[PDB]
Design a protein around this ligand. Structure first.
Ligand SMILES: Nc1nc2c(ncn2[C@@H]2O[C@H](COP(=O)(O)OP(=O)(O)OP(=O)(O)O)[C@@H](O)[C@H]2O)c(=O)[nH]1
Ligand SMILES: Nc1nc2c(ncn2[C@@H]2O[C@H](COP(=O)(O)OP(=O)(O)OP(=O)(O)O)[C@@H](O)[C@H]2O)c(=O)[nH]1
Ligand SMILES: Nc1nc2c(ncn2[C@@H]2O[C@H](COP(=O)(O)OP(=O)(O)O)[C@@H](O)[C@H]2O)c(=O)[nH]1
Ligand SMILES: Nc1nc2c(ncn2[C@@H]2O[C@H](COP(=O)(O)OP(=O)(O)O)[C@@H](O)[C@H]2O)c(=O)[nH]1
Ligand SMILES: [Mg+2]
Ligand SMILES: [Mg+2]
Lengths: 426, 427, 161, 46, 427, 426
């Protein structure tokens, strides 16, 4: 009844979405040939939220990829569950922007965005009453950011009344792949602050930290990190796909977590995440769950919440649990560490429960806390942006394409009023 | 004698799922819908060999309602009363009162219209809702407004579930509560306040379940409602219907907020423990260890009280108990009521439910009183409402829907006016 | 018997001093007297329950060695018994019991297949091959423990069953 | 995922005070060590 | 008639464990909770075929409490009366009177309130406690504090266990005993003293047990309690209630420190070695070879005496024997009372317990006396209290709890006035 | 209900804790595989005081081990019950102090105390009502003494209302491991005299002495020494773990043995300890235990109590025993040697009985004596400290790290005033 369409941008987004569609199809028992192989009928009644029954019980993921290099497409098709997509949604350019936000926003988008708008318009008209759109990308590359950026803008000006999620990985100086990361991220967030409904900030630095400490893997390939964030995305959409004793849809969570229309960046945590050796010496209870939830090392961003103040917080629980134990636990963690919470908003925790755990675990939880600690990371990247812009390094490749300086001045000013208003509300 | 029950919100349907389950197992009706005259107040004998509830489930999201449609009472409840929306108000009184209400409450009205047509001796309606949510607040208030303009004279029992002060599920629930009170101020006739924290203390202390869920909560709520309606369901030595609650519990046309309590809340082994008589539960009904609202009646002054009794009770002991309560000074009444009690008794005991955590109890007491502890409760929620309102927090969602600052300001001062009324009657 | 180096007699005062002869058998009235002289103060109705549990016959004579064990500490009961063998031989027989019990625990699970294999064949050297094939290590010290057991493959597996 | 599991010492038998000897180490055999039980799957060439 | 018993401290609940065991076998009620009117003073008949004791065990170390719950009387003692804290006062009157008492005295007093509400003809409460420990002293004092503001005029029989002079289990027990008496003087109405070495002497001599545990102690003490409650559990030829202990044994409202004595304490072999009668037991109940408090009555002068009898007792031989006692000079009374005797006769002999060290006796005596020997005792306590008080030993623990030196000094001087008062009434 | 946490510092701390966990695990019947296999249900009721149920009767000991050398950790996973610990609690550094109180207190504490304080905060707030914490450590090694010192100070400033036990071995000249024994021991006790609630002073000289005389073993490795002190620890905590005819907890043993808040050092003695050749010839009575408990050759410290006065004493008994004989034996020993007791404190004995004997035995006792004989050892230590400090031997390795001279003078002054007040109350 409520619908979500999926949009993946760039190589990172496509691999993330591939892992995402794999794990959700596992959650609903659909084999890589697209046929039903589950047992419980509870899996059946809520697959319309992500699928369309094509030909006699054949289910297609309601998704649209978009990128600029065929190597991405081949990596999508090589793996399992990579042949369940409809090839009409494989909308795809040919030349490539290559970590160039200007190219991904002005040259290639100018002839690619009309077509992708057609396929998303078709996929949106195919259903009845949209709930929201989902867009996965990063903020370092150009092809994922820039085109996904203009894609978000065109969707907003077309359908401004529907929910919208964007999962964006932000680059850090510790995990610093490309060189023009600030020139990309600043411009992208400069668009995200006026277009997207809300965003979920992700970072590879925190991913590497948690696979060191909590997971203790030796070789954390990209597949595991994508497995982590996909478990997060499955956790945030679990309320729509399964009934619970306290339901919280995407719109309900957004209206509960966003106090002011510019404050829509959230740091994410997910539990339980224990090493395979430590999985035996542990218990499964809600305080055990909560203590790993509120741990600062479990956050998926490089912003220490104890360095700032929590504005709001939200907890999504999976598994048949005791609601009385839930609120009293939330009551305690707000009463004990009372300084980390904001003063002029009481009861800063929203909590929800669903009676369906993920497969393989008896009970799980996702933490979405809106703190003011994120201004650190924004200041972290804006000082690099200013550092390069002081003497105009790497500027001419954007300049000679058609972009000019006032866009950058507008980006830094928007970042500056942004961070100053976090400090104001801090 | 008939009365209709509607359920507005995620909490209402689950509560009704407990109530009607209790009712059919009270009247010996299997979930298929047929029996293998007392049902005539809740059930109409559809065709013959089938009974339909006089009920209307209504929500905006489909997940909980179609869960009922695939549940066990798929045939008992009949598939056209379960009105369902397409998308949730999502804890937004504006969206629930103006956006989606205008397309859904019309169908609700014209459905309950023909239900009232089918009815003959309508006593009243009763609505189930939690003012913390959006759906239970917004379209519920809008429905009550149109229901008042429809009938006006007939009693509408608002069994509301308030948010606890320290125990909270939502964030904007103060905003929702304020806006909803501004409508139920003048819409509902008789309205009963039920918190969640007192219920949590009850299941912790008496029922002694360490890890409870909402099922046991709604089980006791349904038992409260069944105890309140068994007076019209079955003949007792002293039965009282829905109409007299306006002349006995309502001294002022704007103060209609009753504190509910029940006794005895007794587990299976504790029935083996305690010898049940009436004096102890009569006391037990007044202490905060058995109330349904987290408040202190010691800080409050009682105005009017109702005491429904079920089972094997002779009136001599309830007169002796009220006499000893009146000469006892631990609970002080208001100086404007010399007699502030009203008793009632029905023969049939409240039954046990399969899997329920209650024992076979010989007699039971349902206490419905009024105090100024609500006068404290309103101040407690008004203040925390003013906190978030001082910096215009979360206001942009309601204005984006289309509301303004006027209704916030006027409801704030009106609830202020509610406080000055409470402080004036308390003296 | 609180504390002295002569208390085992006061315990011997219970029965074994005042029973002139015979095995451990006591008449019911005599048992009542020997109890009330020590301070038990048993009622006859309760007294016959003792005879019911400790004598399912119409004999009325009672084996007190079985009853006084529960009345006594296992350390102090030996004083009342008077005789307890601490000999090296008794210890060695306990060792042999422990070893034989251990061997029975080893061969028990695979005792059934050993019968089918021995009938598929009996010499001792052949028993080693059979036992090593089925999966139990059979050694010379194992033979030294099993020497009082047999010498017969049939009764061998039977006693191991 | 995943070390020195047991540090070198003598290993007595479950109930009796008898130590495992080399007379009990064979492929397929199983040894009970500290209420655990290990099967000897493969042996060294030496 | 009804009288309920609460037990304060590790010792008191073990005492109650013995008394109620003895009461149930006295009224023929199996440990399951039912028999296969006299019980009404201790048991309420819940439902049908279930009798619950009117008791409140309370302690701060839950181990012993849960041992009662997992013992053999799991079902008689219904599992809610046995109130338990989380951690001990740990031999600290300060921690017992202020630290945890403020969280447990409330729940205790509202539970006993509702217990009294079950009661109808309550004559009084009786407390069992040892002033040596912390829990029995501190929160026991605070309970007696809030119980005296609750009722006050009702008798609270304090059967206390004082530390022996040369036999000692603790070290700070003088400080605990002084501070407890500092409030025991104005809290308990009737207080009976029970030392432990005197019990050891009795079990050594009369019972010829060389290696006893606390069970035989508690067994005999329970037989004292049952002997002094046989007047309320049963009717006798000459009955005396609980209210008369203030009229006969307490001439001045502060000298209530009573020594209990029981006779005949006789083993089964001595039941045959001796042909029992009355006069030898009238003489046996007076000597310090049969008293329950280590002191010497020959150095002091008696104030008042209570003689309880159970069994086949004719008042003529008792009257003649008390005549010979009043003519005999080996014991001297004070010159302020010509008649310092009060007797009581009961038809029912004290029953034996399974494996009890006392045989089936035809007649038994429980003696409750008052003298100045307790004044020698308290001087012996005050001397050793001042011994450790001169160097300020263990004071910082109470100060660390939050107390000061004022209450210590005021306790020391209050007993100094106690000794002066005893030396004035002794002349 | 009541909760006790374990803390181990240093190599000696780990091995003592390992053997101690072995004994109490066998006491509660749990196997080295972490499951219950006992018979008496009385074992089940008081296992929460040291364990937490993880998965189907999986009870992990509520312990935190701490060291700086991996071989210690390897030696911990070695014996039985080495795989019953949760490796997350294996909080552990990498550099190593190496008999350096300064490294154990200033440098390595700076990066280790955050982690250990984090895990003990988890291990403490996991349970509701703590009774106290436990610390086993040494006074000769660096990481044991120094880091445990910093830990005790930090937990006392955080949680001062909970009880706290400290079992420390003090180095002796006759059993001399290293050279910096006084420079460590004096500084550590200088912190103990204000931070620790109470301590049990141990020594290996008395252990070897007791083993030669009573046990008469010919090769007493460190194992049985751990077995002895474990029997002590089990005796001091058994009364909480088992009901008795008269029970006594940590707190009242403290309130009953502390007349003055600075005199919180006790000597210990465990009974019965007899060689198996002499096991056969001995009676089992309460005077038979008393004669060995009050014997000066059974104390576990290098201080003869008959050279001074017993300020107070206490005895914890295990096994179904008769109370009258208990208190009469206490009265007897009180009155016969009426010289060795302090005058202004009558009734210098505390005693408690628990009905559960240790496994393999019938009746036992442990002794805790607060006497002024311990200032013999302390003077014997301080004279070595001043012998070194007068001419500044080994001083540079401490000064060149951050430590200064007033730390030595404050330690000496605190040392001298405590032996003075011990001489005063003598
Ligand atoms: N007694 C009781 N109250 C409940 C239960 N479930 C939810 N509530 C209350 O309902 C309030 C929120 O409203 P919900 O009923 O959950 O949802 P809603 O009424 O549909 O409003 P929306 O969430 O915006 O759709 C919470 O504050 C809870 O106190 C329940 O099972 N039992
Ligand atoms: N007569 C008798 N006295 C006892 C018994 N048990 C303990 N006592 C006395 O009680 C005193 C200490 O108080 P306890 O009851 O043991 O413990 P408590 O009163 O709860 O105080 P805490 O130990 O601080 O918890 C001791 O000095 C004993 O003399 C008993 O079984 N019989
Ligand atoms: N989570 C995740 N991030 C990735 C992956 N591969 C690359 N990235 C991030 O993406 C950034 C580079 O973006 P890029 O791949 O050029 O974006 P694209 O070209 O549009 O796909 C780097 O900083 C990486 O941290 C992946 O497999 N998973
Ligand atoms: N009782 C006992 N003492 C030990 C043990 N191991 C070391 N010690 C003593 O501890 C001191 C050295 O401690 P050390 O190993 O340096 O502690 P660490 O460096 O902090 O781990 C020496 O005086 C030893 O006598 C042991 O296993 N048992
Ligand atoms: Mg809802
Ligand atoms: Mg106690």
């Amino acid at each position: 009844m409520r619908e979500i369409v999926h949009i993946q941008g760039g190589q990172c987004g496509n691999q993330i979405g591939a892992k995402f569609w794999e794990v959700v199809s596992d959650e609903h028992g659909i084999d890589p040939t697209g046929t039903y192989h589950g047992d419980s009928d509870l899996q059946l009644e809520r697959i319309n939220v992500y699928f369309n029954e094509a030909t006699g019980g054949r289910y297609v993921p309601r998704a649209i990829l978009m990128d600029l290099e065929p190597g991405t497409m081949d990596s999508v098709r090589s793996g399992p569950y990579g042949q369940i997509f409809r090839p009409d949604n494989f909308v795809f350019g040919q030349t490539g922007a290559g970590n160039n936000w200007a190219k991904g926003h002005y040259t290639e988008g100018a002839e690619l965005i009309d077509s992708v708008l057609d396929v998303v318009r078709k996929e949106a008209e195919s259903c009845d009453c949209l709930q929201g759109f989902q867009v996965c990308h990063s903020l370092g590359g150009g092809t994922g950011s820039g085109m996904g950026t203009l894609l978000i803008s065109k969707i907003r000006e077309e359908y401004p009344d529907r929910m919208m999620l964007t999962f964006s990985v932000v680059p850090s100086p510790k995990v610093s792949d490309t060189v023009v990361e600030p020139y990309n991220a600043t411009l992208s967030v400069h668009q995200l602050v006026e277009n997207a409904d809300e965003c979920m900030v992700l970072d590879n630095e925190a991913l590497y930290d948690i696979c060191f400490r909590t997971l203790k893997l030796t070789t954390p390939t990209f597949g595991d990190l994508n497995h982590l964030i996909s478990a997060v995305m499955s956790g945030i959409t679990c309320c729509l796909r399964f009934p619970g004793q306290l339901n919280a849809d995407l719109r309900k969570l957004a209206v509960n977590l966003i106090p002011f229309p510019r404050l829509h960046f959230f740091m994410v945590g997910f539990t339980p995440l224990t090493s395979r050796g430590s999985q035996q010496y542990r218990a499964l209870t809600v305080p055990e769950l909560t203590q790993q939830m509120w741990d600062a090392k479990n956050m998926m961003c490089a912003a220490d919440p104890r360095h700032g103040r929590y504005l709001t917080a939200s907890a999504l629980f999976r598994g048949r649990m005791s609601t009385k134990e839930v609120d009293e636990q939330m009551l305690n963690v707000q009463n004990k560490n009372s300084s980390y919470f904001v003063e002029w908003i009481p009861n800063n925790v929203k909590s929800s429960v669903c009676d369906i755990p993920p497969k393989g675990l008896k009970m799980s939880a996702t933490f979405i806390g809106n703190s003011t600690a994120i201004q650190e990371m924004f200041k972290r990247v804006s000082e690099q942006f200013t550092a390069m812009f002081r003497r105009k390094a790497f500027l001419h490749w954007y300049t000679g394409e058609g972009m000019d300086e006032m866009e950058f001045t507008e980006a830094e000013s928007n970042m500056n009023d942004l961070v100053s208003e976090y400090q104001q509300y801090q | 004698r008939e009365v209709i029950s509607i359920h507005i919100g995620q909490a209402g349907i689950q509560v009704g799922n407990a109530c009607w389950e209790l009712y059919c197992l009270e009247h010996g009706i299997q979930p298929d819908g047929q029996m293998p005259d007392a049902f005539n107040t809740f059930f109409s004998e559809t065709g013959a060999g089938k009974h339909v509830p006089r009920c209307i489930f209504l929500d905006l999201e489909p997940t909980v309602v179609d869960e009922v449609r695939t549940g066990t009472y798929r045939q008992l409840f009949h598939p056209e009363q379960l009105i369902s929306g397409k998308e949730d108000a999502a804890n937004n009184f504006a969206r629930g009162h103006y956006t989606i209400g205008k397309e859904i409450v019309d169908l609700a009205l014209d459905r309950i219209r023909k239900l009232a047509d089918n009815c003959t001796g309508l006593q009243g309606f009763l609505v189930f809702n939690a003012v913390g949510g959006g759906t239970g607040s917004g379209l519920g208030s809008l429905l009550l407004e149109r229901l008042s303009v429809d009938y006006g004279k007939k009693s509408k029992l608002g069994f509301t579930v308030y948010p606890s002060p320290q125990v909270s599920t939502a964030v904007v629930e103060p905003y929702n509560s304020v806006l909803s009170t501004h409508s139920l101020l003048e819409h509902t006739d008789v309205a009963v306040m039920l918190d969640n924290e007192a219920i949590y203390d009850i299941c912790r202390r008496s029922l002694d379940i360490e890890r409870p869920t909402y099922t046991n909560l709604n089980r006791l709520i349904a038992q409260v409602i069944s105890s309140l309606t068994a007076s019209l369901r079955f003949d007792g030595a002293l039965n009282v219907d829905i109409t007299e609650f306006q002349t006995n519990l309502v001294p002022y046309p704007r103060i209609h907020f009753m504190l509910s309590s029940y006794a005895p809340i007794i587990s299976a082994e504790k029935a083996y423990h305690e010898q049940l008589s009436v004096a102890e539960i009569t006391n037990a009904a007044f202490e905060p260890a058995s109330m349904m609202v987290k408040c202190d009646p010691r800080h409050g002054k009682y105005m009017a009280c109702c005491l429904m009794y079920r089972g094997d009770v002779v009136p001599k002991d309830v007169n002796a108990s009220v006499a000893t309560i009146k000469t006892k000074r631990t609970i002080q009444f208001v100086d404007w009521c010399p007699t502030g009690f009203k008793c009632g008794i029905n023969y049939q005991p409240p039954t046990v439910v399969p899997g329920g955590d209650l024992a076979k109890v010989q007699r039971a007491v349902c206490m419905i009183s009024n105090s100024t502890a609500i006068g404290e409760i309103f101040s407690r929620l008004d203040h925390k409402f003013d906190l978030m309102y001082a910096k215009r927090a979360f206001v942009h969602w309601y204005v984006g829907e289309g509301m303004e600052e006027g209704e916030f300001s006027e409801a704030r001062e009106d609830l202020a006016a509610l406080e000055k009324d409470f402080e004036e009657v308390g003296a | 018997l609180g504390n002295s180096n002569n208390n085992a007699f006061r315990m011997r005062k219970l029965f074994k001093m005042y029973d002139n002869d015979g095995s451990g058998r006591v008449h019911f009235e005599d048992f009542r007297n020997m109890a009330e002289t020590f301070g038990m103060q048993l009622d006859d109705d309760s007294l016959m329950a003792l005879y019911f549990v400790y004598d399912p016959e119409g004999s009325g004579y009672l084996e007190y060695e079985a009853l006084v064990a529960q009345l006594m500490s296992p350390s102090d009961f030996a004083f009342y018994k008077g005789y307890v063998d601490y000999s090296q031989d008794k210890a060695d027989e306990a060792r042999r019991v422990e070893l034989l019990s251990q061997l029975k625990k080893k061969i028990g699970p695979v005792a059934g297949d050993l019968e089918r294999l021995l009938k598929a064949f009996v010499s001792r050297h052949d028993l080693v091959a059979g036992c090593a094939s089925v999966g139990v290590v059979l050694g010379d010290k194992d033979f030294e423990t099993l020497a009082p057991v047999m010498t017969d493959y049939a009764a061998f597996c039977a006693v191991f069953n | 995922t995943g070390g020195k599991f047991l540090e070198r010492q003598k290993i007595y038998k479950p109930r009796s005070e008898e130590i495992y000897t080399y007379l009990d180490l064979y492929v397929g055999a199983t040894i009970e060590v500290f209420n655990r039980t290990f099967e000897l799957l493969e042996a060294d060439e030496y």
